Amino acid sequence: GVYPCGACRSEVNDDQDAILCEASCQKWFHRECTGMTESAYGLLTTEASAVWACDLCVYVFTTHLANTAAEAVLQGRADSILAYH
Numbered sequence: 001g002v003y004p005c006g007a008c009r010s011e012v013n014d015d016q017d018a019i020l021c022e023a024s025c026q027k028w029f030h031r032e033c034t035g036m037t038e039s040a041y042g043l044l045t046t047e048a049s050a051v052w053a054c055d056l057c058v059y060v061f062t063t064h065l066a067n068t069a070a071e072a073v074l075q076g077r078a079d080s081i082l083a084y085h
């Protein structure tokens with residue numbers, strides 16, 4: 001991989017789930033280093049309007065917000081994660 005993970009500092013390879021901090025620092029992170037669920041990653045990364053912000057740093061989601069929003073979506077309590085911005 002070209003980029004190192006914002007959290008653990010090890011390389012991000014193409015076969016690992018990874019998310020870019022587009023809110024600001026523009027660093028790539030392994031999904032598993034952030035604590036983001038597989039569910040949130042799937043929903044966040046497909047949603048063109050949403051961006052992710054790392055713990056140090058168009059609708060912005062932190063990990064915990066993305067996690068909480070996806071749980072609500074999947075329980076049928078919200079229409080998309082954008083509702084949680």
Ligand SMILES: COc1ccc2nc(N)sc2c1
Pocket residue numbers: 006007008033034035053054055056063
């Ligand atoms: C290792 O330091 C970080 C920096 C940013 C960050 N963002 C997260 N969601 S976990 C995390 C950990």
Ligand SMILES: [Zn+2]
Pocket residue numbers: 005006007008009010029030033
């Ligand atoms: Zn990492």
Ligand SMILES: [Zn+2]
Pocket residue numbers: 021023024025026027053054055056057
């Ligand atoms: Zn950041």
